[PDB]
């Protein structure tokens, strides 16, 4: 029900913006994690139902609902972005819960974010 897209090849120092389209997006609380190369997976933002967000400040988040989106921005890469991002949803209200993969009930594909130079 939910698919990443906006990723690609992109620098050190460079900005990203990633989007998750949601096939009801308004009741569900929005988190994303990564998986890069050798790491296991790893939190990285979310944002709940009810607008507020937790942090794993690099990484930000906005949901546009009239959109069913949810937005993903890395501001200032680093070696460390290389990684699968994965957008999830979970029907939990907003809680440090949201930090932890096992909350969240759906899940994407994931977008592949290469950082080269
Ligand atoms: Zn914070
Ligand atoms: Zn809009």
């Known amino acids: 029900q939910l698919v990443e897209s906006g990723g690609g090849l992109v620098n050190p120092g460079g900005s990203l913006r990633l989007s998750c389209a949601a096939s009801?997006?308004?009741?569900?609380?929005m988190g994303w994690f990564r998986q890069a190369p050798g790491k296991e997976r790893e939190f990285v933002v979310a944002?709940?139902?009810?607008?507020?967000?937790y942090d794993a400040g690099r990484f930000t988040i906005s949901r546009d609902n009239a959109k069913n989106t949810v937005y993903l921005q890395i501001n200032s890469l680093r070696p460390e972005d290389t990684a699968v991002y994965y957008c999830?949803?979970?029907?939990?209200?907003?809680?440090?819960?949201?930090?932890?993969?096992?909350?969240?009930?759906?899940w994407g594909q994931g977008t592949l974010v290469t950082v080269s130079s």
């Open positions: 999830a949803s979970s029907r939990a209200y907003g809680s440090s819960r949201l930090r932890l993969a096992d909350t969240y009930e759906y």
């Open positions: 009801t997006f308004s009741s569900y609380s």
């Open positions: 944002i709940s139902k009810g607008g507020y967000k």
